[PDB]
Amino acid sequence: SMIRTMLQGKLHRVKVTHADLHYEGSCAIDQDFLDAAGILENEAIDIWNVTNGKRFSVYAIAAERGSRIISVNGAAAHCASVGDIVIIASFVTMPDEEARTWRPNVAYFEGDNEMKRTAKAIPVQVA
Amino acid sequence: SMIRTMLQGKLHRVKVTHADLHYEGSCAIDQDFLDAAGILENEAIDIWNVTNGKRFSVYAIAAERGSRIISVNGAAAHCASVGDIVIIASFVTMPDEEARTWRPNVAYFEGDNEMKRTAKAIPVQVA
Amino acid sequence: SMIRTMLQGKLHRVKVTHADLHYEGSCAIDQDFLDAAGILENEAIDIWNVTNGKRFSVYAIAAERGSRIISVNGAAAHCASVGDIVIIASFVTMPDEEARTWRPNVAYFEGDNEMKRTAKAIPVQVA
Amino acid sequence: SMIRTMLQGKLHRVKVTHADLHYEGSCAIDQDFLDAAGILENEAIDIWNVTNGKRFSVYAIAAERGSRIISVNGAAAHCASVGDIVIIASFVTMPDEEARTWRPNVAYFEGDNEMKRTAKAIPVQVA
Amino acid sequence: MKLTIIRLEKFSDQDRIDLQKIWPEYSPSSLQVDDNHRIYAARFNERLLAAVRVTLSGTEGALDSLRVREVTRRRGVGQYLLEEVLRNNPGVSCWWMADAGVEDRGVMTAFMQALGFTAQQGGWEKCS
Amino acid sequence: MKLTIIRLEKFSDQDRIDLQKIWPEYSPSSLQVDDNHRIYAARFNERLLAAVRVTLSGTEGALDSLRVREVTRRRGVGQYLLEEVLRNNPGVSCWWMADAGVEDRGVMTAFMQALGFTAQQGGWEKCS
Amino acid sequence: MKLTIIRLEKFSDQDRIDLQKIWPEYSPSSLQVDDNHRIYAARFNERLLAAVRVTLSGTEGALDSLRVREVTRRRGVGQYLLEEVLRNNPGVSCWWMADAGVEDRGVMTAFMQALGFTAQQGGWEKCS
Amino acid sequence: MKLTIIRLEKFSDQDRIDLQKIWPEYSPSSLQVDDNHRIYAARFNERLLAAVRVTLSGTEGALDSLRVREVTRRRGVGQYLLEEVLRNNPGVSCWWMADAGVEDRGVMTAFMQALGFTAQQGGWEKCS
Numbered sequence A, B, C, D: 001s002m003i004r005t006m007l008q009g010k011l012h013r014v015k016v017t018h019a020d021l022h023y024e025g026s027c028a029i030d031q032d033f034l035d036a037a038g039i040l041e042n043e044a045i046d047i048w049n050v051t052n053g054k055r056f057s058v059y060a061i062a063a064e065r066g067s068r069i070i071s072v073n074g075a076a077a078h079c080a081s082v083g084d085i086v087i088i089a090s091f092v093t094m095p096d097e098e099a100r101t102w103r104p105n106v107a108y109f110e111g112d113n114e115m116k117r118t119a120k121a122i123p124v125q126v127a
Numbered sequence E, F, G, H: 001m002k003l004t005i006i007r008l009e010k011f012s013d014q015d016r017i018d019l020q021k022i023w024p025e026y027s028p029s030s031l032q033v034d035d036n037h038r039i040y041a042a043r044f045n046e047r048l049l050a051a052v053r054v055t056l057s058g059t060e061g062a063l064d065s066l067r068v069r070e071v072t073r074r075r076g077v078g079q080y081l082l083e084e085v086l087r088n089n090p091g092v093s094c095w096w097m098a099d100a101g102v103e104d105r106g107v108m109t110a111f112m113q114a115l116g117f118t119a120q121q122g123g124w125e126k127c128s
Ligand SMILES: CC(=O)SCCNC(=O)CCNC(=O)[C@H](O)C(C)(C)COP(=O)(O)OP(=O)(O)OC[C@H]1O[C@@H](n2cnc3c(N)ncnc32)[C@H](O)[C@@H]1OP(=O)(O)O
Pocket: E023, E025, E064, E065, E066, E067, E068, E069, E072, E073, E074, E075, E076, E077, E078, E079, E080, E100, E101, E102, E103, E104, E107, E108, E110, E111, E112, E114
């Protein structure tokens, strides 16, 4: 009954395609990307912006499958601009014993949001 | 037993009616608004300020039903001013299988905090 | 099985007595104050600084009972100074049905950290 | 069924050995350090930077055992530089009755990330 | 912006691209709009998600060509669109929708019933 | 500011608006205040939420017209108001409240008992 | 940067230090690389974690000396390295890996099977 | 700063105030310190929490007057203090602590046993 908070999945280095203060507050994500990282519509997500250093939390909504959209909408549009490179993460909680064997859903992107690889682990950083 | 954090409900684009550092720290919200979004007295809430970009977390208290009050009180009054347009959100946790079918409680506002619509879903953003 | 995040208790407008970057990182709190608000040693707490507007999260440690100490230690000492007036809050999670009847542990202070009142509810803000 | 958020463990005053925006976003930590503080690969962690005052949340990945590495990678590298002194913390949730007797896993460092002491409690701060 | 139901009197180029996706079977012009022949659409984040054609004859009104983009179904768009059409035409006391072109009549029936319409031969009626 | 119990000696215009909401049956003036005829009120975020009239006769004291705004009941306002009235009048050893005007005597009794008062014929007493 | 599979044509000093850790039994030079004798490696955060030698003979290809650093095993590095070697050599229809130097043949077999290879006498084959 | 075990050779005014709280029965001076008569203390956030007197006679060493402030007991302060005293006096092979002044001998015994000491008549010994 000790419960851990674990990285569930992440979209690594996606590029923001739209950022508009007047769009409905949320981050809209291509449904294919949500599926690859295991992120649900309406789920809380953290966004870490590699371009400008800002870190903020919002919730995900769906964008049309195959659009490659990453739309930072509403008040969140203060925190990102079109063309920024961001990491989008979701966290889940589970008991300690399950956490020890947990494998997160990682998806990697290059170019104009082309998905290059999905994986279940991050390697160890060596000296 | 993997637990998700999901948007429970939100007040979309309410306007701050009062902001005072000397009032008791909290965000006081018209009880009708709390009911529409499913937000409880004493519940933790996040506030995203569309006017100034600030994002902060506090807790809700009740304001008189029908007053249309959104009062940003205490230290939080550093983060919002009268007339700012804010999104107020609450998050809940539930198991993965329930999260997949979860529908949040959304309420939309225009003008001087006139409630225009309640809904149970946010549409998909298309290209 | 929908779980809410609720205000557990708060220390309202305590004054910082010590702030030192070289002290062990934590916020040390008079044990009487911890007891009044229901805050545990080692529990995560949020601190909202009314004087300077900063909002930060740390964890509580105990200070000698009756010392009236509120010591903001380590990296947190970047966020508060001696004589600042702060609100210290802890949040718990519980099921929705319990959350509806939950009463938080509130303690109010004046002067040099003299505890004036404990309560189990915050009133409704009227027009 | 009231659930508390408790400090699980901490690395006290480790020094950042690497900080690179182009490395894969994460904080990589010597496996010996993770073991001492009870922190898991893929677990959410908070980082409090004593040198520059920044506070940010990310997730842990492993670095080679015995390397003494603390690598602040990706967008997080906006928040720390080589040679900064940081506190790295993880939080768990548990029921109130367990929280009352909980002992966190604390590890203390001096010099070039030499581990000097592990402990299960933080003392009381006296007047 | 948030989901909003609008009455379309002039079409932008973006409205034409979107209307083509909603109704690939029409090629507008072909879509004459005037006081009694109206198009209402559901707009969200600068795009049209759903549209319906309305024909008014005073106290009688007819609906045709109701379609919500498949990608955004079951999110309350269709319901809000029809609710708003009815609210914005308070003079109409009898509404008819024919079953023409409907791809799945049982889904249509369950939707229409949710909106207070009765199933009849050839379509659905709400005649308060 | 936080809930605070105050003794009202002069009324601002805001106090008059609030007192009208607490006591619509009184129209002040009509509310003479002097050393022995006191009004205590509960203030929260610049508004009065509850008030009570106190009449002092040395070691004997009387309370009337206790009302907390319905919107903010069962949040400890009434309790704090009476606690503070008693603490700020330490010379009074016997307190009386008549049952006049009380809308729900069983709720009043349970409140008064919580505050250490005994139910008697015609009201409630605390005579330490 | 993220885990990336590279073909090594020239070695930096860092590549030499890392290759020594991956293959302490080789002392390069000794590692001649040319068009048909290739080294592919897995790079992560500016370090090599795993490497394999590839010998090409047109439609036939041979793999030897596959090793992932023990510290980073069972994190998908070996799988990605071989997947990428196969994808980047689409002209090869038959691949062979001999069992030479393999420390634990049963682990190797389970890995190779996961990658579509069949166990044979003396090694593993994938001959689409 | 973090809990640190120090050897006290000179006393600040703050050390004197703290030592008075740890040992109200001593009034220092009275506390002569020299090479063989040492005081070790546990410091945390600029205050002393616990102290012990050590008397050295080469390979034999004696401990007396071990006390941790009651407010901070059972947080590992006493253990760390004695561990550090032993580690910083590696020439001593036999340690003695008499049971003099101990308020609760059963708690003392359980502590001393946790630190590797054996209970004897009149005190505790660790004679590696
Ligand atoms: C050229 C031409 O256009 S010809 C006309 C062609 N049109 C068609 O073929 C219709 C194609 N279908 C659609 O466009 C849509 O599916 C519609 C209009 C039927 C429904 O629109 P939606 O936006 O998906 O419906 P909405 O989410 O508002 O549903 C409201 C209610 O209707 C009912 N409903 C909707 N879809 C369904 C379904 N698939 N099954 C059962 N009930 C349903 C439910 O009661 C629902 O409420 P709930 O979700 O709270 O349970």
